[PDB]
């Protein structure tokens, strides 16, 4: 019961090696026909292209999380966010793109309709100078924000080492639900700040507070893919970590089948790998 990826890493070392392990992920509707292995039509749909931040990042239809709450007629079923599976079920994680000033309502709508409890934002409003996301949480000091019938009130916040734990009292109908936003601000960008002690500390913390887990960054797939997969393994480990050829590759392989490019960087690939690693 001691699979040794350990005694097999000492030789799986660098670029071309990890590049070729990352090149093999040509999970771009390939095989023998780049024909919509997984179409993306509700994303490309008329009044929906604008609900999408990045263009390229199109959410799959078979995994697209639709909306049902209809606070106002105007409501659209579409939200750029997919359901990624976990060790047991098919609604373990939900990866969305950064909310948009327009998609703020939908964002909450979901959170509410899908009874999420733990939100994970792996960005900073602005990174490298450019804006990467839209605020939706209400900060302390002030009081009540308001995204439609949805009222977001911060009960408090833990300004911890590399992230802040938000507690947000959200009142929709005459009912108010409590939510926790793990705002992971630290993280250079997408290359190699290889010291994921906190990416693990965070994940642990989240597992400290079953209902879906809303993981999201900017495109909602770069850094969110990397969390999912670490936690996903994190999960196998502490129970039965099915030793099949099941590796980080085959792992991210299933991951990017739910959402295009759930890990689009070799560096991020090597990252989810090294963290999986530290978990000895």
UniProtKB/Swiss-Prot annotation:
Induction behaviour:
By muramyl-dipeptide and lipopolysaccharide.
Disulphide bonds annotated for this chain are 123-217
Its localization reads: Cytoplasm
Q: Give residues annotated as binding substrate.
A: 217-223, 264
Q: State which tissues express it.
A: Expressed in bone marrow, B and T-cells, PBMCs, natural killer cells, monocytes, dendritic cells and neutrophils. Both isoform 1 and 4 are predominantly expressed in lymphoid tissues and cells. Isoform 1 is expressed in thymocytes and both mature B and T-cells.
All copies of the Tyrosine-protein phosphatase domain together span 18-279
Impact of changing residue 221 to S on the protein? Decreases activity 7 fold
Catalytic residues, per the record, are 217
Q: What is the recorded post-translational modification?
A: Phosphorylation on Ser-29 by PKC/PRKCD abrogates its ability to dephosphorylate and inactivate the SRC family kinases.
Q: Which residues, renumbered to this chain, carry the PTM Phosphoserine?
A: 29
Q: Where is the signal peptide?
A: none
Function comment: Acts as a negative regulator of T-cell receptor (TCR) signaling by direct dephosphorylation of the Src family kinases LCK and FYN, ITAMs of the TCRz/CD3 complex, as well as ZAP70, VAV, VCP and other key signaling molecules. Associates with and probably dephosphorylates CBL. Dephosphorylates LCK at its activating 'Tyr-394' residue. Dephosphorylates ZAP70 at its activating 'Tyr-493' residue. Dephosphorylates the immune system activator SKAP2. Positively regulates toll-like receptor (TLR)-induced type 1 interferon production. Promotes host antiviral responses mediated by type 1 interferon.
Pathology noted in the entry = Systemic lupus erythematosus: A chronic, relapsing, inflammatory, and often febrile multisystemic disorder of connective tissue, characterized principally by involvement of the skin, joints, kidneys and serosal membranes. It is of unknown etiology, but is thought to represent a failure of the regulatory mechanisms of the autoimmune system. The disease is marked by a wide range of system dysfunctions, an elevated erythrocyte sedimentation rate, and the formation of LE cells in the blood or bone marrow. Type 1 diabetes mellitus: A multifactorial disorder of glucose homeostasis that is characterized by susceptibility to ketoacidosis in the absence of insulin therapy. Clinical features are polydipsia, polyphagia and polyuria which result from hyperglycemia-induced osmotic diuresis and secondary thirst. These derangements result in long-term complications that affect the eyes, kidneys, nerves, and blood vessels.
Name the family: Belongs to the protein-tyrosine phosphatase family. Non-receptor class 4 subfamily.
Subunit record text: Interacts with CSK. Interacts with LPXN. Interacts with CBL. Interacts with TRAF3 (via MATH domain); the interaction promotes TRAF3 polyubiquitination.
Q: What's this protein's name? A: Tyrosine-protein phosphatase non-receptor type 22
- Give the organism the record lists: Homo sapiens (Human)
The range of the complete sequence contained here reads: 7 to 290 of 807
